[PDB]
């Protein structure tokens, strides 16, 4: 059905009209198979999500199946296109891809994160029809978190003359560009070209680096190199230098990109073009001062981010990534880790493009499986590829460990938003056996990264080291030795200055912090961290992990220290699985069933709504906001009364004084509770924070970073007045958070509104709507779980409808779902032609909203 011809981008979208069918029996790798019968899918896909939760699967996996999943697609390639080179690429196929092309087996792939590609030139039928097929084997038990299953990512089809760029051919490094910023930067770069014709071929690159966008002519470097000879079926590789004159550095604050274009020609006539995204740019870790970007110093405030989008399930979609970007850079993040798998590029390209530091982490465990998953990448760690397995993207000299590290390295090398490849998490947790193997490992594994790309440094997440571990001490004493930085999970204050005393060469920051475990919305307490009865925890900063901390103490021990670089808190968003403290590592229900099925980990929840301790982080992050945040709802029924009448109220804020203020029902006078200024702390190398150091501050330190007043229980409004270092008054309604709670009366209404307005009608771009349940005057009801029914209409579709809540096992893929905490999303996708979208939310006993989309075609 689809087309393939000469007059397509070079690398283009082969995302559409694929077949898909569930089966554990089926072989349909023959062209000839009848597939009129399957469901058509436009990939990306998953085809965990839609299946139903199940009590014998595995709540680390969110209980839900896996299998075996059959994709094909029929095209015709034109007659033109024969002697050209065709490859398909997929960024990730989760797990254990199979693929055949015209009936002819191609190879294998099992990791389900990185990337590969396959030649489809030897077996393609010019001016015919062709059959790509592939089967997707995700056996569980295969993973600690919600995978997902199928080709999750983004597929492409390349398309090149004979004589081309190598796949990922171009390798560019500055060495100097500490040194030379601001005037000529040194560019060296490696150009893998490959003759893939029957004659030698004497070619010629021609380099040109001009702004991202722009025209060549705003050029601000090129080289032509000399002629090089090739012979037929050989590759080479060709060295060059460009002078590139005064280049505007990759920042965060501005993430300045280029193109870097190859053209490749032989006699005069450009036989291939290949372009790759650049940005200049150099970083540092010292191991007294931490981090710096551009000889700037840095902290860096990240989080952990798993792959899944939410009711989308794995699906890698642009949009949904760059939402959770977004969302997190308003918090003040300026860093994310790749927990604990390649990112999709598309994130890549976000992070790129709007100026977040990346982790970029490719491996969870190493030669050794974890907590029982037997099927996990532990069983293909340490084995070889075999010889009739053309599969392509990295090295196939040695074990798929070093193809899967190297082809992600491969794809991502010239992305400025990386700065860091992280080699492992925990990879002596959760697993049998000895130990005594590990250093070895971890010394292969980073001379392997150091060959791959020698511009960026290696690290790990590793845990035993708060519990110094002899292998833990050799594997930072060998990540020191080759350029790399140490990270410790969750290590507190003693033990980050332990590490610095123990270990002075080695430069640390927190790779994996907090693990705080928070609903969205639950107030009638101020514990947790542990199982409750009603399956869910408080939104109080009380609450974590036995092994974790809470948000304030795992900050705070890392803000005062500035050899600690940064912190990676456990996590930015919830995720799929790992439901913890309803956790477990084989099959069964835990507790009560329906059992808890998503994390509750995240900062912001996995309809991207941010629960409490979102506007903590921004308090203490983000410079260019200023936060203003009360919590509890003021409800009787969802307060924590201790007696006395009194309810905890905590306010967060980057503010230096707050008037905390009480209105009585119906009243309209405000009455003064009381103040509280914060103390400004300075470190060595200038980084500030504020601190509550008055007569009534907490025994416990790290619980300062913030205010808290007891306040009787009483109907009305509580509010907060902010005032800045020279006692100006914040504006009121200039802040982040709620600067002020009201009792509310019952549902009466919904409010709808969507993220964005007016989407592209591609069949991929997104709209979030995201919808209140509140009363007559506005003020969201803090408990309401009213079940909300979406009408789309028009040139859109309803993709996913999600609230967050961990126990809620209605689908994903239905048409209503209760509200959780007053909220509840609906994500329409757009189709492939120009419209508009409506989209209607009611409920039972409430008044509708309404919200209108448009739809752009694509220019
Ligand atoms: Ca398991
Ligand atoms: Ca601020």
Not at 101 to 120: A, M
Not at 738 to 753: E, F, W
Not at 811 to 837: H, M, P
Request: hydrophobic share 35%.
């Amino acid at each position: 059905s689809s087309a393939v011809d000469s007059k397509q981008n070079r690398t283009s979208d082969f995302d559409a009209n694929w077949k898909f069918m569930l089966s554990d029996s089926v072989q349909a790798q023959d062209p000839a198979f009848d597939d009129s019968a399957w469901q058509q899918v436009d990939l990306p896909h998953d085809y965990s999500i839609t299946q139903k939760y199940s009590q014998s699967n595995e709540a680390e996996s969110a209980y839900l199946p896996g299998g075996t999943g059959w994709y094909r697609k029929s095209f015709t390639i034109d007659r033109d296109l024969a002697g050209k080179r065709i490859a398909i690429n997929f960024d990730g196929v989760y797990m254990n891809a199979t693929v055949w092309f015209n009936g002819v087996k191609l190879g294998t792939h099992p990791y389900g994160y990185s990337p590969f590609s396959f030649d489809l030139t030897g077996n393609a039928k010019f001016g015919g029809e062709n059959t790509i097929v592939v089967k997707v084997e995700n056996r569980l038990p295969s993973s600690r978190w919600y995978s997902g299953s199928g080709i999750y990512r983004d597929v492409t089809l390349t398309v090149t003359d004979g004589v081309h760029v190598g796949n990922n051919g171009v390798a560019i490094k500055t060495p100097s560009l500490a040194t030379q910023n601001g005037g000529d930067v040194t560019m060296n770069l490696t150009t893998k070209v490959a003759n893939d014709t029957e004659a030698a071929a004497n070619i010629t690159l021609k380099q040109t680096v001009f702004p991202k966008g722009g025209k060549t002519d705003a050029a601000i470097g090129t080289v032509t190199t000399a002629s090089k000879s090739i012979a037929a079926g050989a590759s080479a590789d060709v060295t060059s230098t460009i002078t590139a004159a005064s280049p505007k550095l990759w920042s965060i604050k501005n993430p300045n990109l280029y193109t870097v274009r190859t053209e490749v020609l032989n006699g005069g006539k450009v036989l291939d073009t290949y372009d790759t995204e650049y940005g200049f740019r150099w970083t540092g870790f010292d191991a007294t001062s931490g981090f710096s970007l551009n000889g700037e110093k840095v902290k860096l405030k990240g989080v952990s981010m798993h792959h899944d989008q939410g009711s989308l399930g794995a699906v890698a979609n642009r949009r949904a990534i760059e939402r959770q970007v977004e969302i997190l850079q308003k918090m003040g993040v300026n860093s994310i880790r790749t927990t604990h798998n390649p990112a999709a590029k598309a994130l890549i390209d976000v992070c790129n493009e709007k100026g977040v530091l990346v982790v970029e982490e490719v491996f969870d465990m190493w030669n050794r499986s974890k907590n029982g998953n037997t099927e996990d990448y532990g069983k293909w760690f340490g084995q070889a590829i075999a010889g009739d397995n053309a599969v392509l993207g990295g090295d196939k000299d040695e074990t798929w460990a070093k193809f899967d590290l190297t082809s992600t390295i491969n794809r991502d090398r010239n992305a400025p938003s990386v700065i860091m490849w992280s080699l492992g998490n925990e990879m002596m947790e959760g697993i049998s056996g000895s130990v005594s193997g590990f250093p070895a490992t971890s010394a292969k594994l980073v001379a392997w990264t150091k060959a791959a790309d020698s511009t960026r440094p290696m690290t790990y997440g590793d845990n035993k080291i708060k519990a110094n571990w002899n292998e833990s001490n050799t594997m930072g004493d060998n990540l020191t030795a080759n350029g790399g930085v140490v990270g410790t999970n969750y290590s507190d204050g003693a033990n980050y200055d332990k590490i610095r005393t123990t270990h002075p060469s080695w430069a640390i920051y927190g790779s994996e912090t907090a693990s705080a475990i928070n609903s969205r919305g639950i107030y009638n307490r101020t514990t947790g961290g542990a199982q409750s009865s009603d399956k869910q925890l408080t939104s109080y900063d009380n609450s974590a992990v036995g092994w974790g901390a809470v948000a304030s103490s795992a900050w705070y021990d890392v803000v005062q220290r500035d050899f600690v670089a940064g912190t990676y808190v456990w996590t930015g968003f919830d995720y799929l699985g790992e439901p913890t403290p309803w956790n477990g590592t084989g099959s069964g229900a835990v507790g009560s069933w329906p059992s808890p099925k998503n994390s509750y980990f995240g900062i912001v929840d996995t309809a991207g709504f941010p629960k409490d301790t979102y506007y903590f982080y921004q308090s203490q992050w983000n410079d260019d906001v200023h936060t203003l945040h009360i919590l509890p709802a003021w409800n009787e029924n969802v307060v924590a009364k201790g007696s006395g009448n009194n309810v905890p109220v905590v306010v967060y804020t980057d503010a230096a004084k707050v008037k905390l203020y009480f209105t009585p029902k119906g009243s309209t006078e405000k009455r003064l509770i009381g103040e509280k200024s914060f103390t400004k702390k300075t470190t060595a190398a200038g980084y500030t924070y504020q601190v509550y150091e008055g007569s009534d501050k907490d025994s416990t330190a790290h619980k300062n970073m913030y205010l808290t007043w007891n306040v009787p229980w009483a109907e009305g409004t509580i509010s907060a007045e902010a005032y800045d270092e020279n006692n100006r008054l914040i504006p009121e309604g200039s802040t982040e958070g709620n600067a002020s709670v009201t009792t509310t009366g019952k549902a009466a209404k919904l409010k709808a509104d969507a993220d964005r307005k007016t989407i592209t009608a591609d069949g991929k771009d997104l709209s979030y709507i995201e919808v209140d349940v509140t009363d007559a005057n506005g003020h969201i009801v803090p408990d309401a779980a009213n079940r909300v029914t979406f009408d789309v209409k028009g040139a859109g579709k309803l993709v996913g409808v999600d609230n967050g809540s961990s126990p809620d096992h209605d689908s994903y893929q239905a048409d209503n779902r209760k509200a959780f905490s007053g909220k509840v999303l609906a994500i329409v996708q757009s189709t492939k032609e120009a419209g508009e979208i409506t989209v209607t939310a009611k409920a039972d006993g409430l008044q509708s909203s309404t919200v209108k989309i448009a739809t752009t075609a694509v220019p």
